[PDB]
Ligand binder design. Structure first.
Ligand SMILES: [Cu+2]
Ligand SMILES: [Cu+2]
Length: 128
């Protein structure tokens, strides 16, 4: 039915939503990320990363390891199923993945890899 969602990230270091449900009917699914903040990408760096909960941690750590020039995402991370590009206030981005990469029964989670954001910026993506 509906296969698009508008996820926001503000200067207060928080997503405008904390749960996404993807209609199995969707062949693909896209999320649009915008930054209604005022703080630049190096200060208030916001992105949207998807991955199962089991790897929500590592992906977040290794992502801290890398840096601004790496989008705070480790390069060649097979743990991430989909991801936006780290953006700063005023910016927007959207990623369109195939819902076939997702699986029913399995719990996925989306978050932000910028250091110190994943605590106040995560959620659950539900496939049903
Ligand atoms: Cu539809
Ligand atoms: Cu962030």
């Amino acid at each position: 039915a509906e296969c698009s969602v508008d996820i926001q990230g503000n200067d207060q270091m928080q997503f405008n939503t904390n749960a996404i449900t993807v209609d199995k009917s969707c062949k693909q699914f896209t999320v649009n990320l915008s930054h209604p903040g005022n703080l630049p990408k190096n200060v208030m760096g916001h992105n949207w990363v998807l991955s199962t909960a089991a790897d929500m941690q590592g992906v977040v750590t290794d992502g801290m390891a890398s840096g601004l020039d790496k989008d705070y995402l480790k390069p060649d991370d097979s743990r991430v199923i989909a991801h936006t590009k780290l953006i700063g206030s005023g910016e927007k981005d959207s990623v369109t993945f195939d819902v076939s990469k997702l699986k029913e029964g399995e719990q996925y989670m989306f978050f932000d890899t910028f250091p110190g954001h994943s605590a106040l910026m995560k959620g659950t993506l539900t496939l049903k």
